[PDB]
Design a protein around this ligand. Structure first.
Ligand SMILES: [Ag+]
Length: 300
């Protein structure tokens, strides 16, 4: 089982690679790619950690040697103006070298870059909707932290389902479905708005000198490890991710997914929604649809 990290020299990629090197199952392989010439040294650095995970790093313009035999590709390289071209270039190389891998797009804006990725893989004739994921786990683990903080629970024991998209008002935490926890509607409103704007807390506290790299690395690592477990035959693995489903709300939509050996095994129902959640769901479908079309038209 091989995991390739495209964008491994950035802050997100390095934290992701550090977590994968120490937590991937024994016998796994990790390949790091980025443009920067330091990337081979990041792998050598990590290769000194005594886990049964083989790691190698590659630099330059060609990601092929890092992608050969890859089962999972995580793309954290790279707002729309800059990352759209980066995503298309890397997904094109994925479509030529490991077209059957599961692809997790971390590069933002996820709502749009997943649509770009889908259309690029379509042009190569290898697009598989069961294998393309927008990684939205950062909204989930932030929700877990904020809910446990407000309710005095252990943060490890709180799991909040989060649906919709990965930006602004498209992020919908289903607080009504957190077992053993009840909220007032003012708690729901303030908690939902904090989750939807959590990124701004980081950049403001960084004096504008950066963004959320370590927690995003942890989020991507959680989704990546869940994927690897499911691909290796583990049962009951459920994660929310931004995928092309039945299009009931939008072409791409984040929802609980049962993962399997093929990627998506079943797209689970979002369940019963509260009045607040149903309102917030229908009230953001248009801005989500425009995010998708922005990505489609860039390729088409
Ligand atoms: Ag796969």
């Amino acid at each position: 089982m091989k995991v390739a990290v495209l964008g491994a020299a950035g802050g997100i990629g390095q934290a992701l690679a550090l977590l994968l090197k120490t937590q991937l199952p024994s016998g796994s392989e990790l390949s790091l790619y980025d443009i920067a010439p330091v990337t081979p040294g990041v792998a050598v650095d990590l290769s000194h950690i005594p886990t049964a995970v083989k790691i190698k790093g590659f630099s330059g313009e060609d990601a092929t040697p890092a992608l050969e035999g890859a089962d999972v590709v995580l793309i954290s390289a790279g707002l729309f103006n800059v990352n759209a071209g980066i995503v298309k270039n890397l997904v094109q190389q994925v479509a030529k070298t490991c077209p059957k891998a599961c692809i997790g797009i971390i590069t933002n804006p996820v709502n749009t870059t997943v649509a770009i990725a889908a259309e690029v893989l379509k042009k190569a004739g290898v697009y598989d909707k069961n294998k393309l994921f927008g990684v939205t786990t950062l909204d989930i683990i932030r929700s877990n932290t904020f809910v446990a903080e407000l309710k005095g629970k252990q943060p490890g024991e709180v799991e909040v389902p989060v649906i919709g998209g990965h930006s602004g008002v498209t992020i919908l935490p289903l607080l009504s479905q957190v077992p053993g926890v009840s909220f007032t509607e003012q708690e729901v409103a303030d908690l939902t708005k904090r989750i939807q704007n959590a990124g701004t807390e980081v950049v403001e506290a960084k004096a504008g000198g950066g963004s959320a790299t370590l927690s995003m690395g942890q989020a991507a690592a959680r989704f990546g490890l869940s994927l690897v477990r499911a691909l290796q035959g583990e049962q009951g693995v459920v994660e929310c991710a931004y995928v092309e489903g039945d299009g009931q709300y939008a072409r791409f939509f984040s929802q609980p997914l049962l993962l399997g050996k093929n990627g998506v095994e079943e797209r689970k129902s979002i369940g019963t929604l509260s009045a607040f959640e149903q309102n917030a769901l229908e009230g953001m479908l248009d801005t989500l649809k425009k995010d998708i079309a922005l990505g489609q038209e860039f390729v088409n």
